[PDB]
A paper describes a structure:
In Gram-negative bacteria, conjugation is mediated by a large transport apparatus—the conjugative type IV secretion system (T4SS)—produced by the donor cell and embedded in both its outer and inner membranes. The T4SS also elaborates a long extracellular filament—the conjugative pilus—that is essential for DNA transfer. Here we present a single-particle cryo-EM structure of a T4SS complex from the R388 plasmid that comprises all four sub-complexes: OMCC, stalk, arches and IMC. Three ATPases, VirB4 (also known as TrwK), VirB11 (also known as TrwD) and VirD4, power the system.
Numbering used by the authors:
A (entry chain F), B (entry chain E), C (entry chain D): 95 to 231
Write the structure that this text describes.
């Protein structure tokens, strides 16, 4: 649980977050921690006219933080986290709450210096979804 | 070597780097990966009139990247990395080259959710120094 | 000049510096970058009742940084550097200024993994001295 929750946290934070200035590392890291199917789903978020690269670009940024992760089975865990948007005019949008479900495995140590210094454990997401949390409190 | 080089990289990058917007996490992470002696040396960099918080503040930022890490013994490794300063006027200072020497151990898994989700392995720096690299090429 | 100044810097810094925690690497590195005559002069600094290992031990440490290196001939260069002593009570002694004169050559690549990963070029000091700088400014 300790090791898996770390990877699940780092995966969600980097995947969901955005900053023009650091995204290249978060982008490559997310891919490094994703199965090709998952990598493609992720890559597509930066494509077309509605691309994160065009919508947020260098005008707005996304901050992500994980509150709690609890494994529930055989390659599966639930991640409870929040997200918020900041921008160039100094304003901040109200924070949203989201929950990710992550299917995962490990593929063992990678054999490239550019990969082992980022994901030595071989963490890999095989399935991913994240829905809005409804705060029925 | 794979696991230790990761921790040594993340330690140096977060320790040496600075961004008003993300430093609270890098600051706490550095402390989490540092022996109290080391933590104090680090904390002091944010103190007084020459504090990183006042010198860089929200006017300038530091970008750090590690090129190569090679362990050399019994709790000791050499980290070769670069650093550069960016600012609010859109300018960039010439990059500098530096080499860190890190003495380290591991203290095992921590027993707080706020620590295990950042340093589950227990990485801890017990000694740290970083000098300018002289590019006698 | 670029390559030689690097080796001259790394040699002086590691030779003159001291930290109980990292000295084994600096010690072996210095020897790796020294002619047997030079290695012996160096080894002797850790011998007897006035040994660096007993004087500094784990109570005090030496920090060394090189300001400038300028080659002057046929296997010879001048290294301008500073040094300071720190200790366990949290105090720091006033920094001193020193100048080293280094006679040197290269012996080509070494044939042991423990040597090539530290001195692949074969840098070797054949003569060494360092005197106090008199700041007649």
């Amino acid at each position: 649980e300790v090791v898996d929750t770390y990877w699940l946290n780092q995966y969600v934070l980097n995947r969901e977050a955005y900053d023009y200035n650091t995204i290249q590392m978060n982008y490559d890291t997310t891919a490094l921690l994703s199965a090709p199917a998952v990598q493609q789903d992720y890559y597509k978020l930066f494509d077309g006219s509605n691309a994160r690269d065009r919508v947020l670009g260098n005008k707005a940024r996304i901050t992500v933080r994980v509150r709690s992760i609890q494994p529930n089975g055989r390659g599966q865990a639930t991640v409870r986290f929040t997200t918020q948007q900041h921008n160039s005019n100094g304003t901040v949008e109200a924070p949203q709450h989201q929950i990710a479900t992550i299917g995962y495995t490990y593929i063992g140590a990678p054999m490239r210096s550019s990969d082992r210094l980022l994901n030595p454990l071989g963490f890999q997401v095989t399935s991913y979804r994240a829905d809005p949390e409804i705060l029925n409190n």
